[PDB]
Design a protein around this ligand. Structure first.
Ligand SMILES: Cc1ncc(CNC(=O)c2cnc(CNS(=O)(=O)c3ccc(F)c(F)c3)c(C)n2)s1
Ligand SMILES: Cc1cc(C)c2c(O)cc(C(=O)O)nc2c1
Ligand SMILES: N[C@@H](CCC(=O)O)C(=O)O
Lengths: 262, 276
């Protein structure tokens, strides 16, 4: 009666590291003296690996609140889920196909996904920030609003940010400057900011507040939240949201933020 | 039928109530009609329905939802309570207006918490908020979870902080910190304006209230002296419906659609801007 939980490699939400020689996972500890709770997560050859982090801790607490058993596995194709006559890939496809009963991952809540699956109440709220080595007010700063080659800024090409920036007409002149400067991966752009070929990198705030530990600038823009992904026929999902609301109010989500994000 | 009974509650900048133009008797510019039941005297409970004019962030959210989901409404202001509190196992306010089938949905600065979700269905949250702390410049606390709040007498002199009761904020403090809560009752503020006046004049060391309203109040403070710190118990504003209404599925799709269209920041770019 185990829940097939699917997740994805995305720090600081879900760290995955190889097992030791004996098949176990090294016992580490938080900044506070608490021990890090880890779970085995098969995935890509498919070998058992070590999963821990925000969503894992949330999974453990969720697994104990409503009392269920779970088996965690990384998503095969390594995608979050897009509409590619149209069929989902990534964790979206694995949830709808039946390979997973529930998605515990930093999965953005949007309209297209809600027409097939159904999210819980948001367990994490965030948006977008700017990563510079410099002052920037945010998306409304004049140096991005009126682009020049004196201050370069972009994002990952075809990324969730790039796909949305093109989608908006108001950001046409701003996005056209980015399209000529977009990079292949996130690690390339963050290195471009460090090696002084990119002056700003628009990306997810949690990934950039984490990578700074380079400093974030301005207020966040284009807010987006993460929810627990399930099918609309899931009997549990009612209390899945109630537990997310419960953990927000009793301070549990704050402890998760202090342990992983701050 | 497609005519919906929708309740709201005034709280700038999300729901603003303006008096009707005497003649023309029409709501002008970015405005919808909204009626408020006003009593004649205190001897009896007899009154009249004053048709007024409503605007704001949540009002625009209502108009676009009425446009995308395609429905009409008779908007009115709740006069029995405010946002919603369960008094003697009987919900009042906007929540009560939905629970007892006097309003098919509620739009406004309605915080999504667990206890309200057990009696109404909330939509996808469309305005991020929670419980923040507003102080004057120089005051040093880390937030609601600070031990200067949990144990007020542990510090000298004791901090002076309060909240607007009956809402979701005082409710959350009541179950999380029973000592802190029954210490705040001495400093209870009748309104949000009364709270910030007390901060600037120096009778209140901190104001614990909804993060969305505080972030807006901190944005337009005269001289930019009132500041928010840092959100505890992060949640959001949600459109509450009755348990199992047909419209809950459609509203979540329309709200989520406004995000992908750049319409959501389009309204924050309009209503929630701050000078500070
Ligand atoms: C003071 C202000 N905060 C937000 C404002 C405008 N609203 C949005 O930008 C927005 C963003 N995303 C979503 C859908 N995903 S979500 O997980 O439910 C989510 C995430 C972050 C949020 F901030 C939020 F509200 C909701 C929705 C429905 N609305 S104004
Ligand atoms: C924490 C995080 C970070 C990134 C970089 C995400 C992303 O590119 C896509 C998506 C997505 O579509 O769910 N989610 C992300 C979540
Ligand atoms: N927004 C709150 C009311 C004000 C507060 O308590 O912060 C609610 O809907 O319950």
């Amino acid at each position: 009666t185990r829940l097939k939980i699917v997740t994805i490699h995305q720090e600081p939400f879900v760290y995955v590291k190889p097992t030791m020689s004996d098949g176990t996972c090294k016992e580490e500890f938080t900044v506070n003296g608490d021990p890090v709770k880890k779970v085995i997560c098969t995935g890509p050859h498919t070998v058992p690996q070590c999963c821990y982090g925000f969503c894992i801790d949330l999974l453990i607490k969720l697994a104990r609140t409503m009392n269920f058993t779970y088996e965690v596995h990384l998503v095969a194709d390594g995608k979050f889920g897009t509409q590619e006559k149209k069929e989902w890939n990534g964790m979206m496809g694995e949830l709808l196909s039946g390979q997973a009963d529930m998605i515990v991952a930093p999965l953005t809540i949007n309209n297209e996904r809600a027409q097939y699956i159904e999210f819980s109440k948001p367990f994490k709220y965030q948006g977008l920030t700017i990563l510079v080595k410099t002052r920037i007010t945010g998306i409304n700063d004049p140096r991005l609003r009126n682009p020049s080659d004196k201050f370069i800024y972009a994002t990952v090409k075809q990324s969730s940010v790039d796909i949305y920036f093109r989608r908006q007409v108001e950001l046409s002149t701003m996005y056209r400057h980015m399209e000529k400067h977009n990079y292949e991966s996130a690690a390339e752009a963050i290195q471009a900011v460090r090696d002084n070929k990119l002056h700003a990198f628009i990306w997810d705030s949690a990934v950039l507040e984490f990578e700074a530990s380079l400093v974030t600038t301005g207020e966040l823009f284009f807010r987006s939240g993460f929810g627990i992904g399930m099918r609309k026929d899931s009997p549990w999902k009612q209390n899945v949201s109630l537990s997310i609301l419960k953990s927000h109010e009793n301070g549990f989500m704050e402890d998760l933020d202090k342990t992983w994000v701050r | 039928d497609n005519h919906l009974s929708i309740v709201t509650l005034e709280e700038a900048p999300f729901v603003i109530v303006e008096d009707i133009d005497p003649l023309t008797e029409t709501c002008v510019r970015n405005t919808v009609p909204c009626r408020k039941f006003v009593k004649i005297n205190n001897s009896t409970n007899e009154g009249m329905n004053v048709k007024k004019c409503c605007k704001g962030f949540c009002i625009d959210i209502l108009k676009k939802l009425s446009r995308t989901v395609k429905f009409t409404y008779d908007l009115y202001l709740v006069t029995n309570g405010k946002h919603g509190k369960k008094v003697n196992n009987v919900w009042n306010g906007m929540i009560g207006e939905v629970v007892y089938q006097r309003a098919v949905m509620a739009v406004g600065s309605l915080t999504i918490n667990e206890e309200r979700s057990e009696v109404v269905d909330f939509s996808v949250p469309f305005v991020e908020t929670g419980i923040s702390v507003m102080v004057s410049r120089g005051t040093q606390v880390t937030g609601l979870s600070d031990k200067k709040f949990q144990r007020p007498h542990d510090y000298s002199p004791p901090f002076r902080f309060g909240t607007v009761p009956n809402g979701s904020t005082e409710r959350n403090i009541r179950n999380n910190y029973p000592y802190m809560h029954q210490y705040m009752t001495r400093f209870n503020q009748r309104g949000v304006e009364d709270a910030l006046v007390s901060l600037k004049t120096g009778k209140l060391d901190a104001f614990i209230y909804d993060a969305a309203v505080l972030n807006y109040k901190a944005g337009r403070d005269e001289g930019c002296k009132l500041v928010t710190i840092g959100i505890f118990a992060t949640t959001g504003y949600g459109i509450a419906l009755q348990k199992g209404s047909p419209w809950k599925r459609q509203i979540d799709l329309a709200l989520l659609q406004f995000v992908g269209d750049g319409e959501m920041e389009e309204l924050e770019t309009l209503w929630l801007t701050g000078i500070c």
